[PDB]
Amino acid sequence: MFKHIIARTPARSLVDGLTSSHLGKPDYAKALEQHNAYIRALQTCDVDITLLPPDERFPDSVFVEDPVLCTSRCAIITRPGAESRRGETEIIEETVQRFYPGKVERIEAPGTVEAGDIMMVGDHFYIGESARTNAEGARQMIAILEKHGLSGSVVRLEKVLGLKTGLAYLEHNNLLAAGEFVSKPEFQDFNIIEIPEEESYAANCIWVNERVIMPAGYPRTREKIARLGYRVIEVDTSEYRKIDGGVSCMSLRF
């Protein structure tokens, strides 16, 4: 159960975010609206929201998910592989302090980590290795998790750019899997829910106090979720999709 959410308002320089596709550039005017709709969605999940102001110096700052990992025992300020984002950790640490007084950790060079590559299952965190999360980084992470009585294995990435890009743990041993992940050994004791190819983007959803927020326009996937009896909530994030961003990326939940 979550009691807090953290989000940051999209910067105008958002059009110059770190994309890796020819999905086109995002429309600030439209993106700013989707974010709002996003927040209003969370306003109905019995959590209190700490909405941070937009910082133009970081296009992708709206993706607070990556900068930090928030656990039930501590918080780990990560270290963004992408340097244009590495500063984001500093503009959020104050908020992190307020919530985790005296219990704040941080990744030190040369290792790097982006919480987007981490999935939280119970007290275990799966850390998929990517271009953004190198071996050293992940190592320190598990090191820290262990320090505070927590665990964290590692997962190997074939196709997907980030861990929670084809996965989503909706609690109750329910996993959303797309692409490779569907048969990845590690998650065979989970109620793997397959996401069809054309809808692989909906593999990135978030479970919030029994409600489940997902991108708008992915019916099939949507169906399966309502199936399980989750109060599904659709939010159009198309403009974030343009820069590999989704519902999980846009917030910290703890």
Give the domain ranges of the chain.
Answer: 1-254
Q: What are phi and psi of 119, to 5 degrees?
A: -115, 130
d(CA 159, CA 247): 21
- Helix then strand count (H, E) for the chain reads 6, 15
d(CA 35, CA 189): 35
Q: Which two tokens stand for residue 253?
A: 């939940």
d(CA 252, CA 70): 7
Are the CB atoms for 235 and 37 separated by under 8 Å?
A: yes
Report the C-alpha dihedral over residues 214, 82, 80, 205, rounded to 10 degrees: 10
Give SS3 for 151.
Answer: strand
Q: How many CB atoms lie within 10 A of CB 221?
A: 25
Q: How many CB atoms lie within 10 A of CB 186?
A: 12
Identity of residue 133: T
Beta strand segments in the chain, E: 4-8, 48-52, 68-70, 75-77, 104-106, 118-121, 124-128, 154-155, 167-169, 174-178, 191-195, 206-208, 211-215, 231-235, 252-253
Are the CB atoms for 51 and 64 separated by under 8 Å?
A: no
Query: Looking at the DSSP assignment, which residues form a beta bridge with residue 233?
Result: 213
Q: Which CATH superfamily is domain 1-254 in?
A: L-arginine/glycine Amidinotransferase; Chain A (3.75.10.10)
d(CA 138, CA 18): 22
DSSP element (H, E) containing 36: helix 28-42
Are the CB atoms for 75 and 69 separated by under 8 Å?
A: yes
> Exposure string (b/e) for 50-72, b if CB count within 10 Å is 16 or more?
bebebbeebbbbbbbbbbbbbbe
Resolution of the experimental model in angstroms, please?
2.8
Token pair 């953004």: residue = 132
